[PDB]
Amino acid sequence: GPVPSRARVYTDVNTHRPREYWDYESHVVEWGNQDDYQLVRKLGRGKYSEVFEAINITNNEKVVVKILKPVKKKKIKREIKILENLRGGPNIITLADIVKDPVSRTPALVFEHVNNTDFKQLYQTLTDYDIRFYMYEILKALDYCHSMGIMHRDVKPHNVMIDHEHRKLRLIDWGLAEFYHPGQEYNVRVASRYFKGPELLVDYQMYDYSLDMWSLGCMLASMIFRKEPFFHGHDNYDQLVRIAKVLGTEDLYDYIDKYNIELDPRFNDILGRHSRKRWERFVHSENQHLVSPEALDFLDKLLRYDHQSRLTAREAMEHPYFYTVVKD
Ligand SMILES: COc1ccc(/C=C2\S/C(=N\c3cccc(Cl)c3)NC2=O)cc1O
């Protein structure tokens, strides 16, 4: 059987919290007034919810309303409990209210509004300094939620709302987030394909906060190298092959051998043999203004096969890449 694993930091935070902190199945939702919120325009639709811009008519301020599609009550309670636990934290989206939508017959979560620019266009304009600044801001949110016993499990550009005018960032969409408990086996069907960590792609269930650090490394690689997404797999099997063409197959085998994991035999025909690459091969004249020795070393320390070898969020914030970022 597989070798067990523990987070190297914040391992026992939920153990010593009161049970009501992490026992979301017992959470009692405090419902607000559904008539406080007038929907203005639909912003998007996903498989789990629809998202609207709305106005809170008690203060005439914009809010964002996520009306959930039918899903399990425990998953709705999990997201609500996590949002309430994290509320007030650095760069965490604020849950302002929870109401019962009379049409959908489901809960509607009401969030603070961020005047965001879509990442496709925003990422074309970010400078080297901007990328370091916003990476540091994401790390504040990730160290906070990890320190609070929670892994986000869906870090990707679409879930980082940036108001570039005010240099404001919020980490959003906590619907896949979970409480970390030592020894717990988790569902590997989390995160978006391009941001899935190797642990998910080899079906290793006893993972932890370090998953979010792989996803963040994938974001960083796409930004400094101007290739979005960086690891561009056509399915979950090809995703691991794309990773192995950069990190190499020998260290992939070291990873699965450490945890006494077997690869899916369907990789026998597609994985090949690949040396580990040096990050300098991805630098060219059109991205070199975003690349520095510090950026490559930082990236190299996030993108490790072994989840136990990745920088923690706090360690990442100590990295020389962030020395040029102004801290007040
Ligand atoms: C414009 O500013 C904001 C935008 C979004 C949020 C909060 C969201 S959106 C979300 N899930 C999504 C995402 C896309 C489509 C679908 Cl259907 C669901 N999960 C959150 O927490 C908050 C803001 O202030």
The CA radius of gyration of the chain, in Å to the nearest whole number, is 20
Ligand 1-lining residues (CB < 6 angstroms): 44-46, 49-51, 64, 66, 93, 111-114, 116, 161, 172-173
Closest ligand 1 atom, CA of 45?
17
Closest ligand 1 atom, CA of 46?
17
Q: Where are the alpha helices (DSSP H) in the chain?
A: 13-16, 19-22, 73-86, 119-122, 128-147, 198-201, 210-225, 236-247, 249-258, 293-302, 313-317
Asked if 25 and 74 count as a contact pair (C-beta separation under 8 A), the reply is: yes
Helices (runs of H) and strands (runs of E) counted in the chain? 11, 9
DSSP characters over 263-310: --GGGGGT----PPPPGGGG--TTTGGG--HHHHHHHHHH--SSGGGS
In the 8-state DSSP scheme, what is residue 131?
H
Residue 235, SS3 per DSSP: coil
- Elucidation method: X-ray
Residue ranges for the binding site for ATP? 43-51, 66
Asked if 58 and 41 count as a contact pair (C-beta separation under 8 A), the reply is: no
Closest ligand 1 atom, CA of 174?
21
How far is CA 314 from each of CA 9, 123, 201, 305, 321, rounded to the nearest angstrom? 10, 25, 25, 19, 13
Cα 89 to ligand 1 centre (Å) = 18
Closest ligand 1 atom, CA of 172?
21
Asked if 155 and 195 count as a contact pair (C-beta separation under 8 A), the reply is: yes
Residues in the chain: 328
Which of 96, 130, 101 has its CA nearest to residue 113?
96
Residues of the chain with CATH 3.30.200.20: 23-113
Residue 34, SS3 per DSSP: helix
3-state helix, strand, coil in the chain (%, to 5): 40, 15, 45
Residue 114, SS3 per DSSP: coil
Asked if 52 and 113 count as a contact pair (C-beta separation under 8 A), the reply is: no
Which residues does the chain break after (C to N > 2.5 Å)?
none
Cα 210 to ligand 1 centre (Å) = 24
**Ligand 1, residues 37, 66, 159: which to mutate, most atoms within 8 A of Cβ?**
66
**Ligand 1, residues 71, 76, 93: which to mutate, most atoms within 8 A of Cβ?**
93
What's the rounded Cα separation, in Å, for the pair 112 and 37?
A: 12
Pick the CATH number of 23-113 from 3.10.290.10, 3.30.200.20, 3.40.190.10, 3.40.50.720: 3.30.200.20
Cα 160 to ligand 1 centre (Å) = 10
Domain 5-22+114-328: state its class.
mainly alpha
The dihedral over CA atoms of 133, 134, 135, 141, expressed in degrees to the nearest 10, equals 120
Is 173 annotated in the active site? no
What's the rounded Cα separation, in Å, for the pair 133 and 324?
A: 9
Residues of the chain with CATH 1.10.510.10: 5-22+114-328
* Those residues with Cβ within 8 angstroms of residue 234's Cβ, 6 or more apart along the chain or in another chain: none
What's the rounded Cα separation, in Å, for the pair 108 and 37?
A: 10
Which of 275, 327, 259, 324 has its CA nearest to residue 298?
324
> Cα(first)–Cα(last) distance of the chain, in Å?
49
Q: Give me the helix-helix angle, 210-225 and 293-302, nearest 10°.
A: 150
What's the rounded Cα separation, in Å, for the pair 224 and 215?
A: 15
Q: Please pick, among 23, 97, 118, 154, the residue that the annotation labels catalytic.
A: 154
Contacts 24+ apart (CB under 8 A), 246-251: 246/274, 246/276, 246/277, 246/303, 247/276, 247/277, 247/303, 247/304, 247/305, 248/274, 248/275, 248/276, 248/277, 249/273, 249/274, 250/276, 251/276, 251/305
For ligand 1, atom 21: residue with the closest CA: 173
What's the rounded Cα separation, in Å, for the pair 289 and 17?
A: 45
| Cis peptide upstream of residue 90 (ω within 30 degrees of 0) | no
What's the rounded Cα separation, in Å, for the pair 281 and 9?
A: 33
In sequence order, the β-bridge partners of residue 51 are 44, 66
What's the rounded Cα separation, in Å, for the pair 328 and 326?
A: 7
Cα 54 to ligand 1 centre (Å) = 12
- Name the phi and psi angles at 310, rounded to 5: -70, 150
